[PDB]
Swiss-Prot record:
Organism, scientific name: Saccharomyces cerevisiae
Subcellular location: Nucleus
Note: Heme is an effector molecule for CYP1/HAP1. The HRM repeat region mediates heme induction by masking the DNA-binding domain in the absence of inducer.
Stated name of the protein: Heme-responsive zinc finger transcription factor HAP1
Function description: Regulation of oxygen dependent gene expression. It modulates the expression of Iso-1 (CYP1) and Iso-2 (CYP3) cytochrome c. In response to heme, promotes transcription of genes encoding functions required for respiration, controlling oxidative damage and repression of anaerobic genes. Binds to the sequence 5'-CGGNNNTNNCGG-3'. Is non-functional in terms of iso-1 cytochrome c expression in strain S288c and its derivatives.
DNA-binding region as annotated in the record: 5-34
Length: 41
Protein backbone atom coordinates (compact mmCIF):
# COMPACT_ATOMS: atom_id res chain seq x y z
CA UNK A 1 0.00 0.00 0.00
CA UNK A 2 1.18 3.59 -0.38
CA UNK A 3 1.81 5.83 2.60
CA UNK A 4 -0.53 8.44 3.91
CA UNK A 5 -0.36 10.97 6.65
CA UNK A 6 -2.01 10.51 9.97
CA UNK A 7 -5.02 12.77 9.54
CA UNK A 8 -5.51 12.05 5.85
CA UNK A 9 -5.99 8.36 6.59
CA UNK A 10 -8.62 9.20 9.22
CA UNK A 11 -10.80 11.37 7.00
CA UNK A 12 -9.89 9.07 4.12
CA UNK A 13 -8.89 11.72 1.68
CA UNK A 14 -6.05 11.34 -0.74
CA UNK A 15 -2.69 12.06 0.78
CA UNK A 16 -0.40 14.00 -1.45
CA UNK A 17 3.13 13.83 -0.14
CA UNK A 18 3.90 17.44 -0.86
CA UNK A 19 6.87 18.47 1.19
CA UNK A 20 6.51 20.01 3.79
CA UNK A 21 2.77 19.50 4.37
CA UNK A 22 0.11 18.28 1.96
CA UNK A 23 -2.60 20.05 0.04
CA UNK A 24 -5.02 18.69 2.60
CA UNK A 25 -3.22 19.96 5.71
CA UNK A 26 -2.51 23.36 4.16
CA UNK A 27 -6.22 23.89 3.59
CA UNK A 28 -7.57 22.66 6.91
CA UNK A 29 -4.51 23.99 8.70
CA UNK A 30 -3.46 20.74 10.29
CA UNK A 31 0.06 21.02 8.92
CA UNK A 32 1.14 20.39 12.49
CA UNK A 33 -0.51 17.02 12.34
CA UNK A 34 1.01 16.40 8.99
CA UNK A 35 3.46 13.56 9.25
CA UNK A 36 3.63 10.65 6.87
CA UNK A 37 3.93 7.19 8.32
CA UNK A 38 7.46 5.93 8.38
CA UNK A 39 8.63 3.25 6.03
CA UNK A 40 11.47 2.12 8.27
CA UNK A 41 9.13 0.06 10.40
ZN1 LIG B 1 -1.66 13.90 3.61
ZN1 LIG C 1 -0.82 15.77 5.46
Amino acid sequence: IPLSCTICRKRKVKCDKLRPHCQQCTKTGVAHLCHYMEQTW
